[PDB]
Amino acid sequence: LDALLDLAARHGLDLDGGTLRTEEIGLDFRVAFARAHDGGDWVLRLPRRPDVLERAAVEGRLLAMLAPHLDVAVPDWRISTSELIAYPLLPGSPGLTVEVSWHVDMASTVYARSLGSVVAQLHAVDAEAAAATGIEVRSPAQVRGAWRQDLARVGAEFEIAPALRERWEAWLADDGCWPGHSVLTHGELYPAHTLVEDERITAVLDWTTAAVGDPAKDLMFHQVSAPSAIFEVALQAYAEGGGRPWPGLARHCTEMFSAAPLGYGLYALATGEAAHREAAAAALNPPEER
Ligand SMILES: [Cl-]
């Protein structure tokens, strides 16, 4: 426990012991919240394994370019080592906690107007400069072919219900759903990474999943959660800020969300734990309703 403060002190950040709090449940990083002697709030990301350092390396280079381009705050890494990532605690409360406690209702026009503005600014940023950070880059042809390749990989290792496959086969063949341009995307945009103050976004956490690809990636969860008119509030703010949404985008987000079992299937293959393919096989092949 006190080794954390020696670890923090070794990197020139003397924190108060009594104010230190742990958030141990995290997979990649064990997260700690602290107050310094100066009064500043600090977030400690302690890498659990060496595997997490590569995406943390790409993230730091992506955050260094990103801060000037967004109105909302983004983690300002001031310490990035093999032992600790430390940035000042960003303002705002999360829109989501995990039991399951929400802090912003998805039917809020204020949050929808905020999301569409943040996403539009993120997507407006030059992709070639974003690519130099080392993130994944996929053209509009490659984002669509990726799902084609993902379906083949999962369908080769898991039995898949025809009701689900046929829906995704129909989703992959419908030209109207698919984007014609690629942008810089957050990759996992949902309220748990959206810090809010009076239902307005003030900072965006966690950019490990950032990549150049489908613009609908960062709008999907809102499309799936919010009422139809509320999602067009976000789309209106998205368009007025430079976003270029296509008519079949809302359907595309719903179809993409129904393909989450494909994501669980790819995860269980890289992970290998039998419980993680227990749930993937159950998602890709649901039993009979009784
Ligand atoms: Cl180092």
Author numbering: 5 to 102, 107 to 298
What sentences appear in the manuscript?
Macrolide resistance is abundant in pathogenic bacteria, and is most often the result of GTP-dependent macrolide kinases (Mph), ribosomal methyltransferases, or efflux pumps. Mph enzymes inactivate macrolides by phosphorylating the 2′-OH of the essential dimethylamino sugar, preventing it from binding the ribosome, and providing the chemical rationale for the resistance phenotype. Mph enzymes are therefore adaptable resistance enzymes with complex evolutionary paths.
While the MphA, MphB, and MphH structures are very similar, we observed structural distinctions in all three enzymes that localized to the (a) NPL, (b) β-hairpin insert, and (c) multiple residues in the macrolide-binding cleft. As we observed in MphH, the NPL, and β-hairpin regions of both MphA and MphB adopt different conformations with macrolide binding. Consistent with the flexibility of MphH in our crystal structure, these observations highlight that conformational changes in these key regions of Mph enzymes play a role in macrolide substrate binding.
